[PDB]
Design an enzyme around this catalytic site. Structure first.
Site, mmCIF file in Angstrom:
data_model
loop_
_atom_site.group_PDB
_atom_site.id
_atom_site.type_symbol
_atom_site.label_atom_id
_atom_site.label_comp_id
_atom_site.label_asym_id
_atom_site.label_seq_id
_atom_site.Cartn_x
_atom_site.Cartn_y
_atom_site.Cartn_z
ATOM 1 C CB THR A 1 94.168 54.699 71.207
ATOM 2 O OG1 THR A 1 95.015 55.831 71.175
ATOM 3 C CG2 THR A 1 92.733 55.156 71.021
ATOM 4 C CB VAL B 1 78.340 35.406 80.831
ATOM 5 C CG1 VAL B 1 76.992 34.877 81.332
ATOM 6 C CG2 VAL B 1 79.445 34.356 80.946
ATOM 7 C CG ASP C 1 95.923 48.149 69.404
ATOM 8 O OD1 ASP C 1 94.852 48.739 69.630
ATOM 9 O OD2 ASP C 1 96.618 48.339 68.387
ATOM 10 C CG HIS D 1 90.036 37.702 95.491
ATOM 11 N ND1 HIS D 1 88.871 37.526 94.777
ATOM 12 C CD2 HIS D 1 91.043 37.350 94.661
ATOM 13 C CE1 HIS D 1 89.162 37.105 93.563
ATOM 14 N NE2 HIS D 1 90.475 37.003 93.460
ATOM 15 N N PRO E 1 78.732 30.606 76.999
ATOM 16 C CG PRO E 1 78.069 29.405 75.127
ATOM 17 C CD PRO E 1 78.171 29.296 76.604
ATOM 18 C CB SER F 1 90.607 37.866 89.960
ATOM 19 O OG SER F 1 90.113 36.557 90.182
ATOM 20 C CG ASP G 1 85.654 37.990 95.052
ATOM 21 O OD1 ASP G 1 85.984 37.977 93.841
ATOM 22 O OD2 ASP G 1 86.458 37.749 95.964
ATOM 23 C CG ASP H 1 82.683 37.473 75.284
ATOM 24 O OD1 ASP H 1 81.944 37.328 74.296
ATOM 25 O OD2 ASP H 1 82.648 36.719 76.273
ATOM 26 C CG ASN I 1 94.316 33.699 87.154
ATOM 27 O OD1 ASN I 1 93.891 34.455 86.248
ATOM 28 N ND2 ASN I 1 94.166 33.962 88.440
HETATM 29 CA CA LIG Z 1 79.151 36.921 75.224
#
Ligand SMILES: [Ca+2]
Length: 279
Positions: free
Chosen positions: A16, A177, A260, A69, A175, A224, A39, A200, A161
């Site tokens: 937390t 995903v 937070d 990567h 939207p 990433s 990737d 999200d 980035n």
């Molecule tokens: Ca979503």
């Protein structure tokens, strides 16, 4: 289970609070789920994968990660030291060449590949895909993300980035995903995280220790590196029974550490991925 002196991001998504270094988690650890890392490829021979990782596709002349990567992102998903979901099956899909560059059309080809291939794999507990990549808005790139998601795969995408609203980037702005921003070990938004109402969730993305090619490790940074924390977490939550591929982005948000992060611009979620194991 507990893993002491863990990379800070694994401790974070089990805390937390910031400032600790143990990763508290249930031992089932993603057993019976499948995560596709789409990737540069995965150095499957890295003992940190212990036999659980397979390339299964490439669009280039070798399936090897000659960049590192893809191997790093995959390690955060599911390597034995550095992974969230330490017992998940990993499947590689090399849509990026050995510099990190992929044409869209090939990235699309990878994505539809997963919606099909999952049907060639044993994933009783659920399927995830982790996309640590993107470029400018494209309807097509975005459509290929909605298809993959619609096909019953939890899709996790890097927000980007540039320190810019992500609605202009793909596949982030799609939207349906789960678009992931990056934080740091002091709960700041990472200085390079895109932001914007299409995000999200946030995960750890600044100084993320993970695997690299040659058998090796490094710490790097990006949305990433944040992305495969949420992918691996979703594999972990499937396996337990908490959520499903179609419900996992909502479940993670519902269960996140809420308030937070500092510097959430106005209008961006202030949500941080959390496994709710220790409290
Ligand atoms: Ca979503």
């Amino acid at each position: 289970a507990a893993q002491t002196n863990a990379p800070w991001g694994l401790a974070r998504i089990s805390s937390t609070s910031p400032g600790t270094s143990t990763y508290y988690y249930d031992e089932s650890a993603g057993q019976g789920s499948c995560v596709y890392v789409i990737d540069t490829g995965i150095e499957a021979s890295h003992p940190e994968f212990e036999g659980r990782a397979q390339m299964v596709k490439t669009y280039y002349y070798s399936s090897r990660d000659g960049n590192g990567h893809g191997t790093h992102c995959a390690g955060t998903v599911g390597s034995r030291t550095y992974g969230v979901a330490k017992k998940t099956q990993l499947f590689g899909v090399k849509v990026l060449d050995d510099n990190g560059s992929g044409q869209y059309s090939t990235i699309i080809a990878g994505m539809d590949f997963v919606a099909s291939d999952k049907n060639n794999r044993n994933c009783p507990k659920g399927v995830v895909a982790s996309l640590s990549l993107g470029g400018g808005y494209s309807s097509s790139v975005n459509s290929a993300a909605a298809r993959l998601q619609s096909s019953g795969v939890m899709v996790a995408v890097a927000a980007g980035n540039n320190n810019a609203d992500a609605r202009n980037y793909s596949p982030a702005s799609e939207p349906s995903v789960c678009t992931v921003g990056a934080s740091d070990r002091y709960d700041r938004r990472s200085s390079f995280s895109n932001y914007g109402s299409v995000l999200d969730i946030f995960g750890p993305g600044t100084d993320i220790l993970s695997t690299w090619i040659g058998g090796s490790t490094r710490s790097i940074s990006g949305t990433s590196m944040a992305t495969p924390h949420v992918a691996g977490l979703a594999a972990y939550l499937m396996t337990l029974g908490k959520t499903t591929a179609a419900s996992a982005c909502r479940y993670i948000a519902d269960t996140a550490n809420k308030g937070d992060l500092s510097n959430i611009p106005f209008g961006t979620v202030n949500l941080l991925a959390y496994n709710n194991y220790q409290a």
